Amino acid sequence: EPYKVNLSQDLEHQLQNIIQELNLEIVPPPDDPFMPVVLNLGKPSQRQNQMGVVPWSPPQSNWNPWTSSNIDEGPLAYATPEQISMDLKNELMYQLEQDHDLPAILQERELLPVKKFESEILEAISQNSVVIIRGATGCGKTTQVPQFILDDFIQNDRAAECNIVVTQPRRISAVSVAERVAYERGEEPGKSCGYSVRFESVLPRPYASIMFCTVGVLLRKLEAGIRGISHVIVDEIHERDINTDFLLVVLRDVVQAYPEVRIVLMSATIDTSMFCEYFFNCPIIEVYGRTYPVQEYFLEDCIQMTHFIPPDANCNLICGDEYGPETKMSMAQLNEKETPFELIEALLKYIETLNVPGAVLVFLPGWNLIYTMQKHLEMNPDFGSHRYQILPLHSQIPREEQRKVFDPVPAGVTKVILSTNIAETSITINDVVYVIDSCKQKVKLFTAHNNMTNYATVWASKTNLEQRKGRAGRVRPGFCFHLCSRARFERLETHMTPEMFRTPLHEIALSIKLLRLGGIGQFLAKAIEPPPLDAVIEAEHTLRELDALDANDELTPLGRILAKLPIEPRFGKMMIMGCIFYVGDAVCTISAATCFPEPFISEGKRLGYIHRNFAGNRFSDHVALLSVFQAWDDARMGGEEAEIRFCEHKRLNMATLRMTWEAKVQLKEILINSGFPEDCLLTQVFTNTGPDNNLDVVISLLAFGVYPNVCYHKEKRKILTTEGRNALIHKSSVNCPFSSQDMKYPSPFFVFGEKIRTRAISAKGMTLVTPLQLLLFASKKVQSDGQIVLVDDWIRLQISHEAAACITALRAAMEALVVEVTKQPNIISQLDPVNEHMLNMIRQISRPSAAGINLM
Ligand SMILES: Nc1ncnc2c1ncn2[C@@H]1O[C@H](COP(=O)(O)OP(=O)(O)O)[C@@H](O)[C@H]1O
Ligand SMILES: [Mg+2]
C-alpha cells in the first residue's frame, strides 16, 4: 500500500520557489494517469590514457621513502653514503656488546628451518630480479627473510643501499610481525622496523630499514612512485588477496622497465606455477623443516569415539557401512549449515583420554562463533580455570591478548585456541598437537548488482583442510578433527575461488586511474587471473554513476578525492557533501566507524538498556554510535583513568573509540589537504532528543552513503528488502524489539548498514529516515502518475507530484554543486546566494517536522 505523506502547503510553496530560482523545469504531471512519467533528470571531458608504468628508483640520501619527502636536517641529510654505512655497522656491534639478552634470542632465530637456506636465498635474490620462496608455514620466511637481506647489506657496508617494503594481506599481520621483527633485533618498532596499516603507522628510519605495510596502504602511496626502495617482499601470495593480485600486475610492469629492482614472493606449499610463469619463469627456493605426519578424522569418526548424541544434498545422511548403527543414526540428526558446539565440547575432553600433552587449535568462522563457544566452555563445569586455558584469536581483540597464544602454559593444563583462519598460514603456534576443523570459511559474498557486502559462512577447500591439518604435527605426531562428513569432503572444491573473481573492483579501478596505468578493463586483463567481465562493467558503471569518472572513463576531480580517501567511494562522496553543509566532522565520524567493529560490549543475546539510551528518539544505530562518541570525547578530557572509567561504566570498548577517532582525524586531514577549509570540519555539539538541523542533514547524507540498503517495517521483527523479499532486524540493533514485543516507529523507512547470512537473512545497523530523505538521497529511479509515486519500483508513495519532482531536482542541483566544489573545494566559503538557498531548502526537507513527524 502507499504511505500517507502529509506536507505543509507553504513548504510545497518553497520547493517550487527554489526550483524556479535555479532556472530548472519540473517534469509535468501525466495527462493520462497511467503514463508513468519519471522524475529523474541528469547533469568538461578529458583526453584518454595509454598503458603506463609506476616509476622506480633505489634508496637516496636526502629522501625519506616512508614519508615520501626530503630531509634537510640531521645526520643523514648532510652525510655521504659510506659515512652512514660505516656508522650503522658500528652501532650494531656496539649493541652486540652492551645488550646481554640480544644473543640469547639470535640463537633462537637460527633454530628456525629457514635459517639453513639463508645462503641460497640471498644468492638467488642477488642474481635474479624476481624470486619465489616457497616453503611450509612455520619455517619463518616472514620474520627472517627480510632480516637476512638487511643484515647482509649492513655488514658489506651497503647499509644505505637497502630499503625493504614487506606487504601483508591482513592489518594484524603487518603490525604484529613488525613488533616481532623489532624485538628479534633488540629494538621497539621505530628503529629499523616500522609498519603502516590503514589509519595507523610507526615509521622506521630513512635508511637500512624494513617497512611492514598492507597492500592498500602501499597502493595509495604509489602516486609518488616506488622511490627509494631496494627490495619489495610480497608475503602470503597463496591467500590470493585481491589487492595482492592487483599489486603483482603493477610490480610485473616494474621489473620489466626497471630490472635492477628486487622482488620476493613468499608462499606456503601450493602450486606456484602461475606465479613463476607470470614472472618470466623466476627461480623457486624451496624451504622445509623436520615435520611429523597426522592422522586426520572426519565427522563419522568424531561421533564414533565419543558416543555423541545431539537433539544441496545433506552429506550427513550418507555414511560408511563399517561404521556402526548408532554412528549413522546420530550424525544424520545434525545439519551441516551450523557447526556443532556440543560435539566439539565433548571432543575436547576425549583428548584428555589420549594423555599426551599439548595445545588444541580450533578453527571456526568469525567472532560470533568464537565468543559463543568460549562462553560455552568457560561458564560450564569440568572446564575449570586451572584445568583448561581457552584463548580466542579473532584479530579483533587486544594485541596483548593475541600474544598469549604463543607463550607456554603451566604443566598439567590444556591450551585451547579458538581462532580464525589467521592461524591457517598467517601465524604459527608452538604447542599445537591437536586441531579441530570447522571445515568452513567466512567470506564477503558480493556479486554484480548485489550492492550489499554480505558476510556468509561457506565450505572450505580441500587445500584448506590440508593446510589446517599441518598446524598439528609441528611438535610430535598429531591429530586433526574435521567436522565434515566423508561424503561432504568429496563434494568440496580443490582450491577456493580467488577474491579477484568475486569482489567489487571499483576501489581497484580508482587506483588504476589515479596511478595512470591505462584503462580499467585493459589493465585487469593483464592479471595473473583476470576478473569476470560483468564485475569490470559494474565497477565502471558504478564510478561513472557518481561522477568519479566521466563517460570517457577518465578520472574527474571528484574521483581523485575519492581515490585519496581510504574508504568506500560512496562514503567518500558523502563526506564531501557533509563538508559543504559544514557537518564534515560528524559525517567523517560515521565513515570512520564503518571500518571498525561496533564499540558496544554486548554480553550476548541482544543489546542492553543503557546502550539503547544512546540512540535517543531518532531510532538510529548510527546516532547511538555518534552519541557515544560525543560522550566519550567529552569524558576523555578528564584523563587516561577518566576515559577508561567512562568506558568501563557504560560497557564500551575503549580501543575501538580511539581507533575510530584517529581514523576520523586522518580522513579530516585528506579533505583539508584537498583544499576544504577548517571551519566546515569543526566539532559541532548536537542533541539526540530535541531538534538538531546539523543532525537532520547528517541523517540525510547517511541515506545517500548507505544507498541502496533500504527497507520497510511491517510486523514486529519483519522487514522487506528493496527487491521485496522478507528480512529481519538484527538482535544487536537498537530498533530491534525484545522477545515477543513490538514498538511503533514515527516512520517505517530505514536505511540500514549491513546484512548477515548464516542462519537466515537480517539487517544490521539501522537508521530511520523520512519520506523526503528517501526521495532526496535514498532512491535513484522514481516514477509519478500525478498523485501516486513509485520509488525504485518496489516502494509506493502517495504524495504531491510537483513536490516529489522538485526534490529529485535539488539532488541533481546538489550533484552539480558537488562537481563545482570538487574543482575548487575552497568554494564552499564564498557560495553564491542561489547555491546557499539550495542548501537551506535541503536542510529544511531533512527535518521530520516538514514531513509531518515529531519524535516526542
Ligand atoms: N610474536 C611471536 N612470538 C613468538 N614466536 C613467534 C612470534 N611470531 C612468530 N613466531 C615464531 O616464529 C616462527 C616463524 O614465524 P613466521 O616468520 O611467521 O613463519 P612463516 O611466515 O614462514 O610461516 C614460528 O615457529 C613461530 O612460532
Ligand atoms: Mg608468513
Numbering used by the authors: 273 to 315, 321 to 588, 606 to 1150
What does the paper say about this structure?
DHX9 [DExH-box helicase 9, also known as RNA helicase A (RHA) or nuclear DNA helicase II (NDH II); EC 3.6.4.13] is a DExH-box RNA helicase which exhibits unwinding activity for both DNA and RNA substrates. DHX9 is a large, multidomain protein whose RecA domains (RecA1 and RecA2), which are required for helicase activity, are bounded by multiple auxiliary domains; these include two RNA-binding domains (dsRBD1 and dsRBD2) and a minimal transactivation domain (MTAD) N-terminal to the helicase core, and a helicase-associated domain (HA2), an oligonucleotide/oligosaccharide-binding fold (OB) and an RGG box C-terminal to the RecA domains. All structures were solved in the presence of the nucleotide reaction product ADP.
Because the initial efforts to crystallize human DHX9 were unsuccessful, mammalian orthologues were investigated. Dog and cat DHX9 were selected for protein production, as each was highly homologous to the human protein with sequence identities of 94.4% and 94.7% for the full-length dog and cat proteins, respectively. Interestingly, the cat and dog DHX9 constructs were found to have higher melting temperatures (dog DHX9, 58.7°C; cat DHX9, 60.6°C) than the human construct (57.4°C) and the melting temperatures of all constructs increased by 1–2°C in the presence of nucleotide and magnesium (data not shown). Crystals were obtained in the presence of ADP and Mg2+ for both cat and dog DHX9. As a result, structures were solved at 2.97 and 2.71 Å resolution for dog and cat DHX9, respectively. Both proteins crystallized in space group P43212 (one molecule per asymmetric unit) with extremely similar unit-cell constants, despite differences in pH, salt type and the amount of salt in the crystallization conditions. The Mg2+ and nucleotide interactions described for human DHX9 are also conserved in the dog and cat DHX9 structures. Cat and dog DHX9 had 22 and 23 residue differences, respectively, from the human protein construct and many of the changes were predicted to be in surface residues.
